Amino acid sequence: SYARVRAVVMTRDDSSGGWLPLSGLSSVTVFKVPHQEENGCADFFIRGERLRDKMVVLECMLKKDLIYNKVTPTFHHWKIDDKKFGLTFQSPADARAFDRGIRRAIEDIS
Amino acid sequence: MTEYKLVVVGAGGVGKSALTIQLIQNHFVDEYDPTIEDSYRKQVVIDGETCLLDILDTAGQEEYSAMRDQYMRTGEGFLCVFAINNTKSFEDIHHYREQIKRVKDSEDVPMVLVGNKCDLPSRTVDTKQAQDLARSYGIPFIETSAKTRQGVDDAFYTLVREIRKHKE
Amino acid sequence: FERLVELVTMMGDQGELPIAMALANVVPCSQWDELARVLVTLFDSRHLLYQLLWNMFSKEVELADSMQTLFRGNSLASKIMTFCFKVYGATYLQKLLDPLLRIVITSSDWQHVSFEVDPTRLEPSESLEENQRNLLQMTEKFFHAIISSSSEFPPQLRSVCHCLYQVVSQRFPQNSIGAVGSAMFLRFINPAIVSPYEAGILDKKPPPRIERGLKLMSKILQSIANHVLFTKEEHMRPFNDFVKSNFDAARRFFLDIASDISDGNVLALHRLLWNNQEKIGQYLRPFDKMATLLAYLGPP
Ligand SMILES: Nc1nc2c(ncn2[C@@H]2O[C@H](COP(=O)(O)OP(=O)(O)NP(=O)(O)O)[C@@H](O)[C@H]2O)c(=O)[nH]1
Ligand SMILES: [Mg+2]
Ligand SMILES: [Zn+2]
């Protein structure tokens, strides 16, 4: 993986008017799936599973034009067209390392 | 050297490309890449005469049937290929042969019936069936296997001999 | 009315579609071409098109030996898919390809445009380097018009490709989008590119020099869709750099279309039904119920 932290996934509620957990603490990973050969073009994803049951709670597909807002330390959110997703981290060191992972992941999109 | 324009026809998945590659490049392709139209050329000696083989690999997918009028118009010999584990494939040869005759405006167009994939242990078209169908057509029948390279030279060389008898 | 097609569209528990699946495995292969026409029009008339596609597509992937055998060759489900592309994307292809084709014929007939890139077939007067450029230019704007056509993709197909996307993903979750895009190009886009007249896009066949270029362009476009380099014909290798760069541009277009009518002719469905009715119950309620309607409504 490009980065691996433990955080709570956030989703903005339009009826609530703010960000809320999607209900658990998850391990969020950034990885690539090769299109053909392992050392070739690939797709990039953000994936998070709740630690209690290893159930996926968020799965994205990284894009070059993706905007990644870092409004406060230990809190990051982005946009995948209609839907909005976010993350709150347990420490800035985990938030900085997760930002470095997806920054290099977009650099490897091609 | 005289040019012999060969054309490979048949249903999709019978092994038209796999048979063509084993003749040209002498190796067996394990992948399934459905073709549109491929062209090849090979020089060889048959019965002592050195000649060029202009080989045309056609599309077995039925969506590309509108291309059949052209390669049947310019082709000289046709290698009708079917798979012995696909009974459908066996009966499709008819509709290819009828269109060849119609565009050639002839009842005697040289062609060979080829039953491919003879390496498999389960076959839905046994040998005596294809022999009787070839007698109905009046053309030779040859069993081939693009995997083990059995009869691949025999199938292509025999089609050339049918074009020689026709030219005389 | 005494005409009950419900029995055909009846769904068992777990959405079995018992009558159609039994009818699919017993009807001769000759009538497969119209059986897809009968079932698609009927289920679409009752807003059950997705149920028919979900059942037939599932059976294909289920019995397919590997991912490269998937929906290659002509089976009933393969006929159903091409029919849906036909009846829903005819206006889509027609308005997309016709402008580019008229620019290739009416314009550019002024010069001696040649797309011949096979050296052993090339006239001495023409140049290989020049014809190679001519092919890539035409292939480029054709490929660009297809990738940029996401906002004009009709919704019925977008439902067909997404339905095809999910069913294969159950057995091949890795790179399942590739199977959608290849069948999309192989069975829908490219056949109309090679033969525009027969597809109903043009009024007459293009000149012979254009027909050779369109055939070569569809070979390149298919390599891009299949995400495979040219490895057979030595004269198509010079284009490998072009197809290697446009791999993921088409992959993005496939990921786009794969993510979310007056019934006519008074189909003699019962004529299709009773001709193949013999021994429908070779399995392993409806057949008994069906026999009463068949006995009352005698075959025509
Ligand atoms: N066991 C076995 N498999 C074979 C043989 N010939 C071809 N195949 C398999 O048949 C499949 C399709 O082969 P291919 O040559 O692409 O068939 P095709 O006639 O080219 N199809 P298309 O008409 O679309 O071009 C591949 O899986 C190939 O490995 C053979 O002799 N034995
Ligand atoms: Mg082939
Ligand atoms: Zn790629």
Author numbering:
A (entry chain A): 13 to 34, 37 to 124
B (entry chain C): 1 to 168
C (entry chain B): 1205 to 1464, 1478 to 1501, 1513 to 1528
Task: Give the text the authors published on this PDB structure.
Sprouty-related, EVH1 domain-containing (SPRED) proteins negatively regulate RAS/mitogen-activated protein kinase (MAPK) signaling following growth factor stimulation. The EVH1 domain of SPRED1 interacts with NF1.
Since the Q61L mutant of KRAS binds to NF1(GRD) with 5-fold higher affinity than wild-type KRAS, we carried out crystallization of the ternary complex using wild-type as well as the Q61L mutant of KRAS and solved the crystal structures at resolutions of 2.75 Å and 2.55 Å, respectively. The structure of the ternary complex obtained with the KRAS-Q61L mutant aligns precisely with the ternary complex structure solved with wild-type KRAS. As seen in the structure, NF1(GRD) acts as a scaffold and uses different interfaces to interact with KRAS and SPRED1. In contrast, the residues that flank the GAPc region form the GAPex region present at one end of the crescent, which is the major interaction domain for SPRED1(EVH1), as proposed previously based on biochemical studies. Unlike the previously solved structure of the RASA1-HRAS complex in which a GDP-AlF3 module was used as a transition-state mimic, the ternary complex described here was obtained in the presence of a slowly hydrolysable GTP analog, GMPPNP (GppNHp), corresponding to a ground-state conformation of the NF1-KRAS complex. In the ground-state structure, RAS-Y32 occupies the position of the arginine finger NF1-R1276 (R789 in RASA1) that points away from the active site.
